[PDB]
Design a protein around this ligand. Structure first.
Ligand SMILES: Cc1csc2cc([C@H](C)Nc3ncnc(N)c3C#N)c(-c3ccccc3)c(=O)n12
Length: 827
């Protein structure tokens, strides 16, 4: 029933669908109807995909950014398996042919009709790629583990598909009437009002008269801009404050509605409390109408006037110094801005990637200059993904500009889209209207790729406790669910597990304040062994990675950290996945995990960029996902310990040492006996270089032995990223205990140590070349509202860390100075 689906969506998104209807908002109504149709169309297309296309939708290939290997292969309806010897260069089809030939000799009598499932995972190997190009195979080679695969027939894939079925004449100056305000404060009240096009003022800000602290102004506010010159995306921004400065509240609104109609007449603005003008703030009023200060205004009846259609703009806009033009096209002066604008045609024809620079010189407060700009924009060639990411910033607020950026981003691969998904979702917070090209783009890509769809859901769901985005995000999630009834239920199962983990964690938090850790742990186990917990916590797809299946919860192995927020350690097993099904999740409640996730995703991007240049620094890109209000999950890295635990140098252990500096190397020797030691020291060296460069570039501070871990393989990785971008200029960090392992436990080993410096330098030089990508992604991330990513000074930290203004030679000299200073500081 449509009624059952509505109650399921309401529970899933954390907001009743009845709340949307109660708003009596035609913009909400049209978004709902329009996006419902769009997502239902995509669902209809999905249910008729061919079986290979269904594999591409549900299990998109996990590929990496000659040698002999053994692979174990079984068929779906059998316990019997065959271990084959194949090559890393061999394709899945050859492996499937071997499997079918062996089955033919066992059962006594077409490879193209099959796909290879990774046992107990929603992950498949298919396509014309050598086995070593698959992430799963690549992972198996590095850990030494034997790949375990299942031959799955096209009819079984089709069965999965089927079961998952669903104007320019108005020359008068712009003016408003400030009628009256509301709510208490300590002084006089002043309303500051400015017209903005993104971060840029369209004219000077006008302030009304001072009135004593239900204030009544009934004052006319006149602006230094003609009504005809208001750009389509013009924002009227307000700041209510007190004066003897005391900030109280702010509110913004678009001057044109979602139907392009110029707004008239009376508007009640439910204001948001302050941390004066906030142009990047939402243009929707505070939903807490009970307690919020309100400002009533009047938009004079200029008479029904709409913004001119594209056909009108283009009609109007249709109507040796080349040297200095080039030198500034790779902050600028007035004569330089005039050069760019005069030669705008030369920008379009010979420097199309300089569109951003031309957009920034355009006079957005003059309709003639805007029409001239829009005329070139509508015939502008599509730009690279990198250029388009810059155009998504609040610095380019125009709707046509926004639409052009999306058009250039349509060529993003699913892998690239996934890499930038977090930032694209954040950009939604800058959107002026509910129905927009970004939302339609995201929803379309989410419905065409189940992994994208999973993370789009979680990035929206995890901010439902934020009133400024709850309506927009709730509406997007509802549209998504209309497009995928099956995935909605899959996501509901994840939500049921998370609700139980929150209840369990609250119980642990209370109990641990009264009894011992073994007693709270045994009480935790009794709670988990309740039928409703065993059921809710088992048989789900991991919110951290939908390809990871969390099958049977292993209660005996579950525990908690008897410190700070008391995070839970939840272990799982899967008889079908074998050793690969042994996975864990950390549930933590009380900390905002958004910065943690951003830091890990930036490190993961670094790893991708390094790997693209043939550099594998053996990183550990473990998952981190906010799921709710100060709630989220962390993927467990098994067979790892903290540096602090190893450094304790406890007795009656294989790691005990004569000197504390040897504890780490002795631990590595115990985990890697004989010939295996050399591979472990190399794993340590590579990862140490990766994380040294990563933490320096990102300005990750407060690094100690308690937030650095080591895998038994020798790989080093970081945890608990509470601080970044130097928000306590953090220098490069080198640790003597780590120098000791790199140097193979020798006091003097300049051969090994300088090979490590070379890894650092190469890693650093690679990231420098992609400096712009980091800058564009961090600029979009400013929309998130993270306290450590709030201004130009936070972005400046990255420019400085990557030394982007300098030449590669100058940058490497500067890096060598910082590395050498870190070497002297290391004892
Ligand atoms: C019980 C528990 C709940 S939460 C928690 C975290 C950690 C460590 C510090 N952190 C990570 N451990 C593995 N994978 C990760 N992704 C992280 C993180 N972040 C350990 C713990 C202590 C000592 C040795 C091995 C583990 C631990 O027992 N817990």
């Amino acid at each position: 029933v449509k009624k059952l689906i509505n109650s399921q969506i309401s529970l899933l998104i954390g907001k009743g669908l009845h709340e949307f209807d109660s708003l009596r908002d035609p913009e909400v109504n049209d978004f709902r109807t329009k996006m419902r149709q769009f997502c239902e169309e995509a669902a209809a297309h999905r249910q008729q995909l061919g079986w290979v296309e269904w594999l591409q939708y549900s299990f998109p290939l996990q590929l990496e950014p000659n040698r002999a290997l053994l692979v174990n292969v079984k068929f779906e309806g059998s316990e019997e398996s065959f271990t084959f010897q194949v090559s890393t260069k061999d394709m899945p089809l050859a492996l499937m042919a071997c499997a079918l030939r062996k089955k033919a000799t066992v059962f006594r009598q077409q490879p193209e009709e099959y796909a290879l499932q990774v046992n107990g995972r929603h992950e498949y190997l298919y396509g014309n790629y050598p086995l070593c190009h698959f992430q799963y195979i690549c992972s198996c080679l590095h850990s030494g583990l034997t790949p375990h695969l299942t031959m799955v027939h096209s009819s079984s894939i089709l069965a999965m598909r089927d079961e998952q079925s669903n104007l320019w004449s108005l020359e008068q100056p712009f003016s408003i009437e400030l009628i009256e305000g509301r709510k208490v404060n300590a002084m006089k009240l002043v309303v500051q009002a400015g017209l903005f096009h993104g971060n840029e003022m369209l004219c000077k800000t006008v302030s009304s008269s001072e009135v004593n602290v239900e204030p009544v102004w009934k004052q006319r506010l006149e602006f230094d801009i003609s009504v005809c010159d208001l750009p389509r995306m013009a924002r009227l921004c307000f700041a209510l404050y007190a004066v003897v400065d005391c900030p109280i509240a702010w509110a913004n609104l678009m001057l044109f509605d979602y139907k392009d109609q110029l707004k008239t007449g009376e508007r009640c603005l439910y204001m948001w409390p302050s941390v004066l003008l906030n142009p990047a703030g939402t243009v929707r009023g505070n939903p807490n109408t009970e307690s919020a200060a309100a400002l009533v205004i009047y938009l004079p009846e200029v008479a029904p006037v709409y913004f001119p259609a594209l056909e009108k703009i283009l009609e109007l806009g249709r109507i040796t110094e080349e040297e200095l033009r080039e030198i500034l096209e790779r902050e600028l002066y007035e004569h330089e801005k005039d050069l760019v604008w005069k030669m705008r045609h030369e920008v379009q024809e010979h420097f199309p990637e300089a569109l951003a620079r031309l957009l920034l010189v355009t006079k957005w407060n003059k309709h003639e200059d805007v029409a001239q700009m829009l005329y070139l924009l509508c015939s502008w060639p599509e730009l690279p993904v990198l250029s388009a990411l810059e155009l998504l910033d609040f610095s380019f607020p125009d709707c046509y500009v926004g639409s052009f950026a999306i058009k250039s981003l349509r060529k993003l691969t699913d892998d690239e889209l996934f890499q930038y998904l977090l930032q694209l979702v954040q950009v939604l917070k800058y959107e002026s209207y509910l129905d927009c090209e970004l939302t339609k783009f995201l929803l379309g890509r989410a419905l065409a790729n189940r992994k994208i769809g999973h993370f789009l859901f979680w990035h929206l769901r995890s901010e439902m406790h934020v009133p400024s985005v709850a309506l927009r995000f709730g509406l997007i999630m509802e549209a998504y669910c209309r497009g995928s009834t099956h995935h909605m239920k899959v996501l509901m199962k994840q939500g049921e597990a998370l609700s139980k983990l929150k209840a369990l964690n609250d119980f642990v938090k209370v109990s641990s304040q009264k009894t011992t850790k073994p007693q709270t742990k045994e009480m935790m186990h009794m709670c988990m062994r309740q039928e409703t917990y065993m059921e809710a916590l088992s048989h789900l797809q991991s919110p951290l990675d939908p390809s990871t299946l969390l099958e049977e919860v292993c209660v005996e192995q579950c525990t908690f950290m008897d410190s700070k927020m008391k995070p839970l350690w939840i272990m799982y097993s899967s008889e079908e996945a074998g050793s690969a099904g042994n996975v864990g999740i950390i549930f933590k409640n009380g900390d905002d995990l958004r910065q943690d996730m951003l830091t890990l995703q930036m490190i993961q991007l670094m790893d991708v960029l390094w790997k693209q240049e043939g550099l594998d620094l053996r990183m550990t890109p473990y998952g981190c996902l906010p799921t709710g209000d100060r709630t989220g999950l962390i993927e467990v890295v098994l067979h790892s310990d903290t540096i602090a635990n190893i450094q304790l140098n406890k007795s009656n252990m294989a790691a005990t040492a004569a000197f504390n500096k040897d504890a780490l190397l002795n631990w590595l020797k115990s985990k890697n006996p004989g010939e295996a030691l050399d591979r472990a020291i190399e794993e340590f060296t590579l990862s140490c270089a990766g994380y040294c460069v990563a933490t320096y570039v990102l300005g990750i501070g407060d690094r100690h032995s308690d937030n650095i871990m080591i895998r038994e393989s020798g790989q080093l990785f970081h945890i608990d990223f509470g601080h970044f971008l130097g928000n306590f200029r953090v220098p490069f960090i080198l640790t003597y205990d780590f120098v000791h392992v790199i140097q193979q436990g020798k006091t003097n080993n300049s051969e090994k140590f300088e090979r490590f410096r070379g890894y650092c330098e190469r890693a650093y030089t690679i990231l420098r070349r992609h400096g712009l990508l980091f800058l564009h992604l961090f600029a979009l991330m400013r929309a998130a509202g993270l306290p450590e990513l709030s201004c130009s000074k936070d972005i400046q930290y990255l420019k400085d860390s990557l030394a982007l203004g300098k030449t590669e030679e100058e940058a490497l000299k500067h890096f060598r100075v910082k590395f050498n200073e870190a070497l002297r500081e290391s004892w």
